[PDB]
Symmetry: D2
Subunit: 372 residues, 4 copies
C-alpha cells in the first residue's frame, strides 16, 4: 500500500515472531529513527531511499522511537502473544510520529472534507470534532479542501459546514480566529474565507490567481469534452440508466432515479457497478494521456457517481501555502487514503499527511495536535 507502512509492519513481524517485541527493542527503533533522520537531511542519498524507492521526501525529523513507545504504552500491542502489530497500528504510529515531529509548530492544518468531515456524504455533524477544530483555529490557519463544485456560491458550501460554522459563531470571533479559516472548493478552483458573523464569503479570483498555474479555457473544455465522449460510450457499453452533468470546470456521470418495490421508498438511484465506474475512470485517464494534456486534473470514482474535475486537491494545498507564506515543514494535511485507489497526487509530496479512517481516529489525531 504505502510502502513505508509495509516496511515497518514486516520489521515488527520479525520482532514479534522472534519473541522479543515486548523486550527492549530500542536498538532497532533507534536504528530506524536515525535512518529516518538521515532522510530529513540529505534525502536524495539516504540509505532509506535505497531500500524503499517511493519514500518521497520527509519534511521533518520523525521521532519514530518515541512514537512507538507512546503508542505501545497506551494500547500495549507488544503484550499480544498471537496478534502481531497490524497495518493500521503502524499507520497510527507514523501518524503519531509526524505529529510530534512538529515541536517547532505548524501554521496550517488542512482537511480533506469529503474524506474526514462529512460522514457518509452528509453535512458536518460532530459537535466534538467542531470543538477541536475551533481550538486549533486559534493557534494556526485551518483550511478545508473539497471536490464539491458549486462555483463561487458561498451559501452552497455553507450548508455542508453550517454546524461547524455555527460552532465558530460562539467560540471564534471574540479572539478573531475566524480570519484563519479557509475553504477551497472545486479541488483548487473556488476559495472562501470567514466573516465576523460566521458566514462564508468568496475570495475573488483576482486576489489569489497569482499563486495558481493558469489553465487555458479551451484546455479545460477539451478535458471535459474528452470525458463527455468517454462517458457516453460507457453508458452505451453497459446499458446505464445515467446521464452526463456538465459544470464549468467539472463533468460527471450521475445515475438516474428509477422505481423500487411499492413497499419500499417509491424512488431510488440507479446503481452503477463499482467495476464499471473504475473502468470509466481510467478509460478517461488514458484518453487524457492520449491527448498529451499537462493540466492538473482529477478523475475519481466516488460512491454511486463519477466526477472529472479540472484541478486536484494537491494543487489546492500548494496554492494555500504559496498564499499564506508557509513552507512545507510547518503544515500538515488530514485525509483518508483507503478512499482513493488513484495513487496519483498522493498529497504527501506537498505537505505532511495524516491517514485517518473514522471520526474517532481524526479526533485522536487532533487531541495529539493540541498538546504540543
Amino acid at each position: 500500500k504505502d510502502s513505508l507502512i509495509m516496511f515497518l509492519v514486516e520489521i515488527f513481524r520479525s520482532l514479534f515472531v522472534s519473541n522479543c517485541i515486548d523486550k527492549n527493542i530500542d536498538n532497532v527503533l533507534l536504528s530506524i529513527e536515525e535512518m529516518f533522520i538521515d532522510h530529513y537531511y540529505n534525502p536524495q542519498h539516504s540509505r532509506l531511499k535505497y531500500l524503499i524507492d517511493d519514500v518521497g521526501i520527509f519534511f521533518t525529523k520523525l521521532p519514530i522511537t518515541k512514537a512507538f513507545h507512546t503508542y505501545n504504552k497506551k494500547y500495549r500491542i507488544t503484550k499480544r502473544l498471537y496478534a502481531p502489530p497490524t497495518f493500521n497500528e503502524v499507520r497510527h504510529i507514523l501518524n503519531l510520529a509526524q505529529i510530534l515531529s512538529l515541536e517547532e509548530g505548524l501554521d496550517l492544518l488542512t482537511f480533506d472534507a469529503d474524506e474526514t468531515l462529512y460522514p457518509d456524504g452528509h453535512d458536518f455533524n460532530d459537535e466534538v470534532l467542531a470543538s477541536y477544530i475551533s481550538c486549533l483555529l486559534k493557534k494556526m490557519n485551518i483550511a478545508i479542501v473539497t471536490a464539491a463544485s458549486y462555483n463561487n456560491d458561498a451559501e452552497k458550501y455553507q450548508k455542508r459546514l453550517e454546524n461547524l460554522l455555527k460552532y465558530f459563531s460562539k467560540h471564534n470571533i471574540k479572539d478573531g480566529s475566524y480570519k484563519n479559516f479557509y475553504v477551497m472548493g472545486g479541488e483548487s478552483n473556488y476559495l472562501f474565507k470567514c466573516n465576523e458573523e460566521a458566514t462564508l464569503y468568496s475570495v475573488p479570483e483576482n486576489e489569489w490567481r497569482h499563486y495558481k498555474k493558469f489553465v487555458d479555457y479551451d484546455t479545460v473544455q477539451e478535458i471535459l469534452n474528452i470525458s463527455e465522449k468517454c462517458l457516453e460510450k460507457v453508458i452505451k457499453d453497459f446499458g446505464l440508466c445515467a446521464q452526463i452533468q456538465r459544470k464549468e470546470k467539472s463533468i460527471g456521470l450521475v445515475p438516474n432515479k428509477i422505481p423500487s418495490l411499492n413497499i419500499k421508498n417509491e424512488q431510488k438511484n440507479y446503481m452503477i457497478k463499482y467495476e464499471v465506474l473504475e473502468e470509466a475512470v481510467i478509460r478517461i485517464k488514458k484518453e487524457i494521456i492520449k491527448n498529451k494534456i499537462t493540466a492538473p486534473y482529477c478523475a475519481f470514482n466516488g460512491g454511486q457517481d463519477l466526477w472529472v474535475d479540472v484541478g486536484n486537491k494537491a494543487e489546492g494545498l500548494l496554492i494555500l501555502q504559496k498564499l499564506l507564506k508557509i513552507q512545507k515543514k510547518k503544515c500538515c494535511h488530514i485525509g483518508d487514503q483507503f478512499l482513493h485507489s488513484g495513487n496519483d497526487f498522493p498529497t504527501r509530496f506537498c505537505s505532511l499527511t495524516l491517514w485517518v479512517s473514522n471520526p474517532q481516529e481524526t479526533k485522536a489525531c487532533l487531541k495529539s495536535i493540541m498538546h504540543l
Copy 2:
C-alpha cells in the same frame, strides 16, 4: 451427514490478516471494501480462505482477460470447468476438482456454471471492460446464479444466518419487503433461522430480535398454516423455537430433537466457559479494557461498556486465539465456536453448522433440497465450512438478499432470468 463428518476446526486459527479487512471500524463503507479487492497483495489470501472455489474462477478469468479473449467465445473453457463441476457432483471426493481445490466442499446439484456466466455477462457485460478484469464479487454473483439455476426440483428448506443477513448493523429485524419475500417463501418451503445469540431458553428475547418479521407473519402466514414451517435456532445449535397461531416463539421440547445433536456433557460445557472466563478476565486486565463479561448457560461474551466504549480489534483477535489455545491445552474436543464479532467476542458451546444438520434431520429434508443464505465475509470457514451441508448463497447486503429470494420465489418459471445483485433494476 453428521457433525463428526464435517471438517470443523474449532480451535484452529486462520492465517493472520495484517490488514484487518474485517475490522468494520476501519473498512466501514462499500467504497473501501471494493478498493481492497483490487490490490491482490492486500486481500488475496483472505478472500481465497473464505471461498477458494471463487478465487479459483477469478484467477482463470484474470488470465482469459490478460490474454485478450474474455469477450470472445470462451465456451471451451467454461464447459470444461462445468464438466469438472458435474464430475465433482458425482464424486465429491477423489474428483479432479477436489484434487485442485481440497476445501471445495460438496456439490449437491449440477451447477450450470456456463449458463451462469452468460446470464450475468448478458446483463452486466463485464467482458466489455478493457481494464478491470472480473472481480471476486462478480464471480461470487456468478456462483450464486449457478446454484439458483440448479434448483430444478425446488427447495423444501431455506435457512438464513440471522446475524449475517437479517439484522442490519446488529439491530433488530427491520425490512418490510424482505419480510414479504420470506413470508411468501414460508408458504412454499420450510424456513429456519440460525443465530449465535444465546438468551438461554428465553423465547421472548429471541422474538424481540425478530419482532417485525413475526408481525408480518401474523398478517399473511397464519390463515394458511404456513407459520408451522418457521423455525429459529438460537445459541448456534442449543435452543430451538417454533411459531404458534399468535406469531409467538415457543421452545420445542428438547426431547423432540436432542437425539439429532451430538451430546456434550455438562462439565465440558462449563469447563469451556470457565476457561474462557479466566482468559477474558486476563485479557481485560492485560489491556486495561472497559469491558464486561456476559456469561450464559452455554456461552460467554466479551462486551464493551456503554458510554459505547470500543475494544481494539486486535485485542479481540488476540483473545479468540488465547481461548482456543487454552481449550486445546485442556484437550477439549467438543464442538464450540469462539469468534471475534466486529465489536465484541463470544464463545458459544455450539456450532451453526451442527445447527443446520439438526434442522435437516429434524425436518427430514434432503440436502439437495436445502439452501443457506449467509455472508462468508463475516465468518471463518473453520467454523462454518463452505458447502458442507447444503447449497450456500453468498450475500453481502440486503439488496443482494432480496434479489436472491425474489429469484427463488420465481424458481423454475420460464419467463424469469434469475438475479442476485439488484432487486429493482
Copy 3:
C-alpha cells in the same frame, strides 16, 4: 520413536515448482543456484518447504538488515530466539516455536544459535555487507554450526545419505580425504550409510558403489576392529550390510533386525510395484520415451536408454504423481517412496527415515547421540521429515561435508572453532 509416529506423506505432493529449481540439467552450476536464491519470487516457497526453520531465521535477519542494525548488538534478538529453541527442546510439541513453525521437527539438543551466529559472523562478517542480507545458505551454515556446537556429550552414530553426500554425480565413491575423515570417525563412533539403490541382497553391487571407501578401511580400520562399526542400509530400509575382516560387505541375517522394521506383507509390496509398472508403461507410451523399466525385488525404476537419452524433467514429475495417485486410489498405506531423481525415477517399497530408526534401535543408540548428513536440496520433506530422527546437518557439496566431519572429529576440543563451509581456509 517409531515409523508410525514420524510425519510421512508418502503419497503427498509438494506444491508445484513452476521454476523447476531441482532440474539439474538447467540449474547445473553453483553460480545459477546462488542467483535464484536472491529472487524471492523465484525460490521462496521451494526453500521454505525444505527447511521452514532456516527460512524463519532468514526473514528475521532480513528485517534486522533493512532496519540497519544487523551489525550492531543484536544479542537481544538472538538470545530470545535461543530461548525459544531451548524451550522447544524441553517441549517438542506445544512449544512457542512449534506454534510458529509447525513442521519445525525435534530438537534433541540445546542449540547455541547465538554462539553460532557470532562464530560464523566473526569469520565471514556477513553483517559488514551493506546490500546483500544474510542468505538461505548462510543461515543453513549457521544452523549446522549450532547443532555441531551442541554435541557436548559426543556422538555414537553418524549417518550419511550416500546418494546425496558420497557419490559425486552419481558415480562410485571417489574422494581420498573424505574417506580419511570417515575412517577416523569410524574409530570413534558407529557409521551407517543409507542409499535408495536396491541391488536386491547382492552385497557385491553395493560394495562396487563404495569400493574406494572400503579399500581405505582395509588400510586403517581393520587392525583396531573399527570395521565392525560400519553399516550399509540399501533399498532405503530393506537390505542391511556389515563389514568383515577383509573389508567386504556381507548381508546381516534378516532375523537379526527384521523386528525393528514395520512389517509390509508380500502382496502389498508387489501390488505397489505392479501398479507402478503399469503407470510407467503408460508414461512411456503417453510421451514416447526411449526408456526402460527396471524392476527389483522391492523397487521399480524408470531409467533412460544409453545412447544417455534424457527424459523430460516434467515427465518425471508427472509420473511420480501419477504413481502416488494410483497407489492412493488402491488404498495402500504402506510406507514407500516414489521420487524424481535428476534423470530417472524410482519407487522403493522402503523409506530412508525408517532406515535410520532401524539403525538406531539395532545399535541401541539414543537420538541425542545421532547425527545425519544429507542434502535437503535433493529430497522432499514428506519423504524424509526435517529433524525427525536425529540432529541433521545440511551439506550441499563435498567441501562442506569435509568441513563438518573435520569439526566433528575435533569435537569438544577447546582450541577448535568449528567450520561447516571450507576445509582448507
Copy 4:
C-alpha cells in the same frame, strides 16, 4: 524473471487447472498472437505494453500459436495431468517463436561465448555444436562475443576456440565462409576475423572505431581506479586472500592460491563467498553512479572472481550490426540469462535474444535455425 515468460506461464496455468489445456485452445493462443503482432506494429501503443510494462520492443512477428503447436506436438506437455507447463518450457516456446519469426531470414547470428560455447569455463569442446555453427556460417554472418580480455592478442583467443576453428579448417574455406566469422573480445573492445588458414587475426582499431561511441582514456582509467579502491576495501572488509589485477580496460578481484590437505591437490584457489562477490559488484555499481559516469561498462560476478570491463556485450552487438550494415529484424543473439543477475543491458533491446542453458538446448535452437 523475464515478465513475458511469467505472462504466459500464468495463462497456461489457468488453462491447465480449468482442464482444457489439452483441447482446442487456439482462441486463446491466436488472441495472444494478434496481441503480439499488434506489438510488432505500433509497439508504443499496444495493449501488450499496457499489460506488461518491461516488454521491450519486438523486432518481428512472433508466431506464438504455431510455436506452441510445434512444441506440444513433440513433447506433449498438454498430456500431463499434474505437471502444468513450466517456466523453462515457456522459455523454449518463445525461443522457438523467435526462430520461426525469421522466415525472411537473418544475416547475423551472435553467441555469448562465456555462457554457451565454453563449458564450465574451459575451451571449446563439442564437435557436434561446431558442426552446426559451420553449417550456419555458410548462410549468415556469425560473431562471437566474450568478456575475456587479452588485448588484441589473437593467439590467446584462438586457444579458447581452437577445436571450433579446427572444424572450420575442414568445412569452411572451399566456399569462403570464413570471411563471415567474427570474434569480439573485451565485451566490445577487440575485434578479430578469420583468415584462409582458420586462424584468428586482429581487425585494427581504426577500421571499426567509427561505429563505437568513443570513450576517453581518463574516464576508463577513472572507472578502473574507482573499482580499484572499492575492491581494496572489500578485501580489507572481509579478510580476503585475494589481490587486484589491472588490465588496460579491465580490473579484477582474483583469488590467491592457498594450500589444501596433503592428500588432496597441494594447491587450490582461495574461495570467495558468492555473497561477498555480489556485495562488491553493486558496491562498484553505486560508486560509478555516484561519479555520474555515462560510459557503458559491465561489472559481473563470474564464478570465483569479479571483473569490471569498460564496454558491455550489448554495445558490441550494436557495433557488429552497425559494421556489417544489418538492422535488428535480421539478427539474433544466443545467451543464458540465468547467468547474469545484473538485469542491466538485457541484450533483447539490441537484437532478438534466445535463452539457452545447456549445450543440448543450444543445438536444438540451431537445428531449428537450419531448417528455415
